[PDB]
């Protein structure tokens, strides 16, 4: 059925058969990895509002 | 109900029911030509004795 959005998540992308994730069954694959410097800065600023950067 | 004639006759009764006031509801999704899908309320004559001309 058209007009449908599907979200799929996994922790081992290597375990997904390539036919399952192809451009037209999954249009966008994004890697959400560990923290980065900017990510840590943003998390610290959001958890402790008001402190100096 | 074991024949496709039952489905065809039920559909024809739902369409040609004149102003029958003993209907029952039936919910479905209709895909508009615009591309999106909205709820469709279709009325089928509820069980009972109905008269046609």
Residues of B in contact with A3 (CB under 8 A): 31, 35-37
Sequence-separated (6 or more) residues with CB below 8 Å from residue A44: A51
Residues B8 and A53: their CA atoms lie apart, in Å, by: 72
Q: Is B7 on the interface with A (CB under 8 A)?
A: no
Which resolution in angstroms does this entry have?
Answer: 3.5
In chain A, the residue whose alpha carbon lies closest to the alpha carbon of B37 is A3
User: What residues pair up with A9 in beta bridges, in sequence order?
Assistant: none
B31 touching chain A per CB within 8 A: yes
Give A1→chain B minimum CA distance, Å.
9
- Reported as type and span, the H/E element at residue B39 is strand B37-45
In the block, residue with structure tokens 């509820």: B46
């Amino acid at each position: 059925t058209e007009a449908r959005i599907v979200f799929m998540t996994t922790n081992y992308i290597d375990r997904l058969d390539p036919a399952l994730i192809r451009p037209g069954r999954v249009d966008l694959k994004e890697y959400v990895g560990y923290c980065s410097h900017w990510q840590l800065t943003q998390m610290f600023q959001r958890f402790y509002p008001g402190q100096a950067p | 109900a074991r024949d496709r004639s039952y489905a065809w006759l039920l559909s024809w009764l739902t369409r040609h029911s004149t102003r029958t006031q003993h209907l029952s509801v039936e919910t479905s999704y209709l895909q508009h030509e615009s591309g999106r899908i909205s709820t469709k309320f279709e009325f089928i004559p509820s069980p009972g004795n109905h008269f046609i001309w």
